[PDB]
Write a protein that binds this ligand. Structure first.
Ligand SMILES: Cc1cc2nc3c(=O)[nH]c(=O)nc-3n(C[C@H](O)[C@H](O)[C@H](O)COP(=O)(O)O)c2cc1C
Ligand SMILES: Cc1cc2nc3c(=O)[nH]c(=O)nc-3n(C[C@H](O)[C@H](O)[C@H](O)COP(=O)(O)O)c2cc1C
Ligand SMILES: [Cl-]
Ligand SMILES: [Cl-]
Lengths: 168, 168
């Protein structure tokens, strides 16, 4: 009883190197629409997305973020943020939004990777500085994306030991 | 440039009423496999899933949880938990896992809803009591699921105001 949605979920992987080529505007638009389709605590919809295409900002962030060095080879990144003034579920909602973005990327032949901003205060401040985020808008993650430079197998993470019936 | 993965992301909605009929074992297995395919900070894979099919536990949880009353009409629920001893990203990883489970459910003609345990300490204690969770294993959410009782339109959440280019 498999299907294409499940295949995409199983196929998704973190891609950290990209070809030097742009990404179609229509694909970026669909990734954002995917992000906004996430579930949301009390249906607040606290997400805010910053689409970064400025070479200098991308490179400046790369230098300052410890595990987002691949920003220097990405043409674009989506910064998934939450309006913490509107919801204390923001980082949960925004994690579901981010996962939709990653799934969307995979489904359109792109590669992407979740790089943490939250929970690291210093990283969040980097992102705030370069994208001019109001104080209440907190960055969950920076998602570089592009066409993969080197296709890879997805990870096979199934682990029966992590399934518990009725009690632990 | 749409596709079936994006359609499923757009179609997913919270379903809170279910027909009185069981769910195929193969579907439940695929939902769990979907959950385990989530991305994970440092690839820790801190998720733990409790599949609850015991009528009494389901009903006892329903009584004690303020916004999971639909457990009394669900045959089963998946409790998404994180091993907080293994990862301080647990609630982010597990939110991505939960979103995969919801997407998987939708793709196989099922309905599901994320009901919060975390961040509410009292709810987390309810779940801990009934599923015997070790202290380090923290419950993110309780996901009742089933065949929908009343099909509904998905929510159309696209909001151009939540897209920012380069700076806020
Ligand atoms: C973090 C989180 C917590 C939620 N908590 C509950 C809950 O306790 N009970 C419930 O019925 N729905 C809960 N929901 C479901 C939301 O109400 C639902 O996602 C929102 O109304 C948007 O509707 P949709 O999922 O149909 O798109 C939760 C969703 C999220 C993301
Ligand atoms: C909460 C979270 C934070 C992450 N942080 C980073 C990061 O800062 N840099 C990075 O390259 N990858 C990061 N990752 C990606 C993970 O390393 C990746 O999901 C994991 O290795 C599993 O690989 P997969 O995504 O290919 O299945 C993060 C993932 C999650 C869920
Ligand atoms: Cl696997
Ligand atoms: Cl929409």
């Amino acid at each position: 009883t498999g299907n294409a949605a499940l295949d995409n979920i199983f196929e998704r992987k973190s891609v950290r190197t990209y070809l030097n080529k742009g990404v179609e505007k229509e694909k970026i638009d669909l990734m954002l629409r995917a992000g906004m389709s996430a579930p949301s605590g009390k249906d607040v919809r606290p997400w805010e997305f910053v689409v970064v295409s400025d070479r200098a900002k991308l490179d400046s962030m790369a230098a300052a973020l410890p595990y987002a060095k691949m920003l220097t080879q990405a043409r674009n990144a989506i910064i998934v943020c939450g309006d913490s003034a509107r919801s204390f579920y923001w980082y949960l909602d925004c994690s579901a939004a981010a996962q939709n973005i990653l799934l969307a990327a995979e489904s359109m032949g792109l590669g992407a990777v979740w790089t943490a901003a939250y929970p690291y205060e210093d990283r969040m401040e980097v992102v705030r500085k370069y994208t001019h985020l109001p104080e209440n808008i907190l960055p969950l993650c920076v998602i570089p994306f592009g066409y993969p430079a080197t296709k890879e197998q997805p990870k096979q993470k199934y682990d029966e030991k992590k399934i518990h019936y009725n009690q632990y």
